[PDB]
Amino acid sequence: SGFRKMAFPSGKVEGCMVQVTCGTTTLNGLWLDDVVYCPRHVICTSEDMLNPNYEDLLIRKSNHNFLVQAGNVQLRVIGHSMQNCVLKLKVDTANPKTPKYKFVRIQPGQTFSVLACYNGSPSGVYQCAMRPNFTIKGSFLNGSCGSVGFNIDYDCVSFCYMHHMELPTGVHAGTDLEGNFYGPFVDRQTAQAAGTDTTITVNVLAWLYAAVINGDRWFLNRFTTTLNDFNLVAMKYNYEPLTQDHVDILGPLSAQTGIAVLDMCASLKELLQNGMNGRTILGSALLEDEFTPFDVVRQCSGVT
Amino acid sequence: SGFRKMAFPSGKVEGCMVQVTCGTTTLNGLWLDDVVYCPRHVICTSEDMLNPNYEDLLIRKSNHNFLVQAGNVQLRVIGHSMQNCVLKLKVDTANPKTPKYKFVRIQPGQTFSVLACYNGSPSGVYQCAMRPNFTIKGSFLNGSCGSVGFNIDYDCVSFCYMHHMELPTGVHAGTDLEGNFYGPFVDRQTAQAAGTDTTITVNVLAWLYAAVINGDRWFLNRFTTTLNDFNLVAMKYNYEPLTQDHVDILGPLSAQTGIAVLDMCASLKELLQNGMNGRTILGSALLEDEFTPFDVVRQCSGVT
Ligand SMILES: Cc1ccncc1NC(=O)[C@H](C)c1cccc(C#N)c1
Ligand SMILES: Cc1ccncc1NC(=O)[C@H](C)c1cccc(C#N)c1
Numbered sequence: 001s002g003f004r005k006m007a008f009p010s011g012k013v014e015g016c017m018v019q020v021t022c023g024t025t026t027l028n029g030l031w032l033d034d035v036v037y038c039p040r041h042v043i044c045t046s047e048d049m050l051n052p053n054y055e056d057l058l059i060r061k062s063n064h065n066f067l068v069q070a071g072n073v074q075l076r077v078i079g080h081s082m083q084n085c086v087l088k089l090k091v092d093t094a095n096p097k098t099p100k101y102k103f104v105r106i107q108p109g110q111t112f113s114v115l116a117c118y119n120g121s122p123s124g125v126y127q128c129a130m131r132p133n134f135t136i137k138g139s140f141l142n143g144s145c146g147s148v149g150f151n152i153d154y155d156c157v158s159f160c161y162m163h164h165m166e167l168p169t170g171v172h173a174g175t176d177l178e179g180n181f182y183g184p185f186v187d188r189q190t191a192q193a194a195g196t197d198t199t200i201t202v203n204v205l206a207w208l209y210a211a212v213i214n215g216d217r218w219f220l221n222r223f224t225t226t227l228n229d230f231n232l233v234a235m236k237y238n239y240e241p242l243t244q245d246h247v248d249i250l251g252p253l254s255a256q257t258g259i260a261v262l263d264m265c266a267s268l269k270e271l272l273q274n275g276m277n278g279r280t281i282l283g284s285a286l287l288e289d290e291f292t293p294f295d296v297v298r299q300c301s302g303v304t
Numbered sequence: 305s306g307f308r309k310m311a312f313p314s315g316k317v318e319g320c321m322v323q324v325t326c327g328t329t330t331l332n333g334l335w336l337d338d339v340v341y342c343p344r345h346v347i348c349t350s351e352d353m354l355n356p357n358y359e360d361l362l363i364r365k366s367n368h369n370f371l372v373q374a375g376n377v378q379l380r381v382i383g384h385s386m387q388n389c390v391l392k393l394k395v396d397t398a399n400p401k402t403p404k405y406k407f408v409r410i411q412p413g414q415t416f417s418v419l420a421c422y423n424g425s426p427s428g429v430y431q432c433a434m435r436p437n438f439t440i441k442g443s444f445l446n447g448s449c450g451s452v453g454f455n456i457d458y459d460c461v462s463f464c465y466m467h468h469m470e471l472p473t474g475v476h477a478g479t480d481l482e483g484n485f486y487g488p489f490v491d492r493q494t495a496q497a498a499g500t501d502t503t504i505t506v507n508v509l510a511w512l513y514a515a516v517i518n519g520d521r522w523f524l525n526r527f528t529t530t531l532n533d534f535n536l537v538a539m540k541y542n543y544e545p546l547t548q549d550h551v552d553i554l555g556p557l558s559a560q561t562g563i564a565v566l567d568m569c570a571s572l573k574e575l576l577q578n579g580m581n582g583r584t585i586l587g588s589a590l591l592e593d594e595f596t597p598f599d600v601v602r603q604c605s606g607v608t
Contacts, residue, residue: 001474004443006428009419011315115313121608124310125429137587139308141606170305170519215474276589278579283441285580285589302445304425 003210003282005290006299007113007127008152015097018075019120020089020146021067028117028146029068029089030159030177032098036068036075036089037177038146039164040082041187049189058082063089069120070095084179085164085187099157103177106160108132109200109240111292112149114161116140129203129290130161132240133195134183135171138163149174154304167194199239200289202246205264207288209253210296211281218279220259223266230265237272249293256300307514307586309594310603311417311431312456319401322379323424324393324450325371332421332450333372333393334463334481336402340372340379340393341481342450343468344386345491353493362386367393373424374399388483389468389491403461407481410464412436413504413544415596416453418465420444433507433594434465436544437499438487439475442467453478458608471498503543504593506550509568511592513557514600515585522583524563527570534569541576553597560604 020029020038023045029038041049043057061080066089068075079090106112111129115122116139128136128149140147140163149161164174164187171194173185185192212220225233231241247261254261268287276285291299324333324342327349333342345353347361365384370393372379383394410416415433419426420443432440432453444451444467453465468478468491475498477489489496516524529537535545551565558565572591580589595603 001445001470002441002443002476004428004430004432005309006420006430006443007311009314009318009426009429011313011318011426014313014315116310118606118608122313122315123606123608124308124603125313126308126310128308137306139306139310139603141305141604143606166305172306275582280590286584299428299443300445302422302427302447304422304427 001214003214003299005127007125008150010113010115010122010125012099012152012157013115013148013150014122015099016095017115017117017120017122018068018070021069022061022065026119027143028120030146030148030162031068031070031075031091031095032101034091034094036091037086037162038089039162039175039187040085040087040179041145041164042066042087052188054082058087071120082179085175085181086162086177086179100155101157101159104151104158104160105176105178105180106130108134109203109292110160111290111295112151112160114138114149114163115147116144117147118143127290129200130182131171131197132200133197135167135173135194135197136161138172140166140172148177167192169194196238199237199287201234201240201242201268202250203289203292204239204287205242205246205250205261205268206253206293206296207282207291208264208268209250209257209259210291210300212257212259213300214282216281219267219271219281221267221270223270224260224263225266225269226262227265230262230269233269233272239272252297253293305518307518307603309431311429312454314417314419314426314429316403316456316461317419317452317454318426319403320399321419321421321424321426322372322374325373326365326369330423331447332424334450334452334466335372335374335379335395335399336405338395338398340395341390341466342393343466343479343491344389344391344483345449345468346370346391356492358386362391375424386483389479389485390466390481390483404459405461405463408455408462408464409480409482409484410434412438413507413596414464415594415599416455416464418442418453418467419451420448421451422447431594433504434486435475435501436504437501439471439477439498439501440465442476444470444476452481471496473498500542503541503591505538505544505546506554507593507596508543508591509546509550509554509565509572510557510597510600511586511595512568512572513554513561513563514595514604516561516563517604518586520585523571523575523585525571525574527574528564528567529570529573530566531569534566534573537573537576543576556601557597
C-alpha cells in the first residue's frame, strides 16, 4: 500500500565517495577499484572556466597535485588521465568497499538515484529522471560536482551520471562515467541552451497504473483511443509520442490491472484535456513523469 | 539550485538490517550492538493476529525459535524480551557495522527517512513526515514490517520509527524503538481509526521559503496578516494552528530571504483562499508539508 518517489539504498555508493582537491578547487570523486573518477574541471580556477583549454591546463599538473582523501585517509596518486570531461586518477590502493559495478549510459526518460555529496561526504539521496532534453532537475549547490547517479540490480551498481554543471536556468547537466555529457553541454562558464523539454508519456502512464493499483481510480473513464488519436493530444500538450515499444513495457501493468494500455491512454487524454478538477492522484495535483514502468513494477512487487 | 524530497544516505542503516523468522513468519530486524529489535508480531501466525495475547504467545517461544540472519550468516540468540510492541533479541555477537545511534521519539509533523526492507534486504529509501494524526503515508508491502525510520546528525543515526502495520485505509502505523506505538494503534487485525489529519502549517511555510530561495516567487503578494487572522484561515482549511514556536523556527528562512514570517503567512492565506490557479511551486501543484524548517535550512546550505 502506498506509492513513493523511492531512491535506491545508497550504501554501496557511499563507500565509494572521496574528496578530490587540485589547487584551490575541491569536488567529489568516485573511487572504484584503484581508480578515482571526477569532473575534469577540478583542475580549473574560476577564471579558467571562462574558456578552458583542458589539455593545456592538465599538462601543468602532476600526480602529486591531485589530493584524494577517502574519509580520513589520504590516497596516493600514481597516474592521471583525461577521458572526455572526466579525470581518472590511478591510485595505489583498490577501494576495499568497491561494490559490483558497471558504467552505463542511460536513455532520456530513464530514472536514477542521486547521492548528493559535498567535500566527499554524502548529504542526501533522491530519485529523479533524465529529462528528454538531457538535463536533470536536481538539488545541487557549489561543491556537489562529482556526485553520482545510479541504479542497482540486486548487487550491481550501474553508475549512469556524474554531476558537472548548473545551467543559468537552475537545471543540472552532467556526464556518463566515461565523461561524455548528456545533451549538448560543454564544461565552460558560458550560457548554454537546453532543448525544449517534454513530458515522459510512458512514465505518466506507468504512474497512472500505480495509482490504480493503490486505489486512486477516479480518473478511469468509459473511453478508449488509438495510438494516432492519443499522439495528436500528446503533441498538443508537449508530451512525448507514444510508440509500440512504450506499449510493450506497460504490458505487465496492463496485465496486473486488466486495463488495456490504450484505455489508460484515453484516461490520460481526458486528464490532459480537462485537468485534475481540483483532485489528486497518488498525493499529486499534476501528472507525474519520474516513474518508469520498471520502477512501478519493482515498487509494487517489493524487489530488493 | 533546485529543491528535492531528499532522504538521508541510508548506508549506516543498511548495515543494521537483518531477517528475523519465528515459526513461519519472517520480517525485518534492526541489529544494533548485541541486540536485534523487531515487531513483536513476528511470533504470531495470521490467526493469532485476530486477538493476540502476546505474553502467552511469547511464553511458548525459546531463544532457539528466533532465527536471525544478517546477510548470509546466522546470529546466535542468547536472550529474548518483549518491551511494549517490540521484541529485543540478545545475540552473542555485536554488529561490527553499528553506527553511533540514539533512539528518539519524534513529534507529529517531523520528518524522517524510511529504509524499506524485505527479508532483511533494503529495497529503497524515501523521505516522509509523521502525520499530525500519527500515521505515515509510506510505501510498504507484506514483509516490510521491521523497516525503520531515522534521521542523521553528522555521524549519529537517531532511529525514530519501526514499521508495524497497514491500516484498512492504506496508511501506515508503527512504533518508536522502545515499541510504543505512535498514535492510538494496537498490533491486532482489527479496523482501527486514525484521527482527523491536518496539514503541517509550519512545513508548508518552510517550503514556501525554499521556493523563494530557488526562484519561485509568483505567490508573493503585497499583503500581511496577524497570527489570529492567519489562524482563522488555517482552521477553515484544516491546517494546524501556527504558534510563536513555529514562527521562531522559521526565523533563519525569514532572515535569509528578508520576508517576514507574517508576510509569508499572508501569501499562504491567499494560496489557501484562491488556489494555485493552474500554476506550480517547486514542481508541485499543491502545498507541500513534508519539509520542516530544519530540512529546508539543511538542504539549502548543503549540510553533510
Ligand atoms: C554552482 C553549482 C551549483 C550546482 N551544481 C554545480 C555548480 N557548479 C558549477 O556549475 C561550476 C562552477 C561550473 C561552472 C561552469 C562549468 C562547469 C562544468 N562542467 C561547472
Ligand atoms: C500487509 C502489510 C502491508 C504493509 N505494511 C504492513 C503489512 N502487514 C501488516 O499490517 C500485518 C499483516 C499486520 C496485521 C495486523 C497487525 C499488525 C501489527 N502491528 C500487522
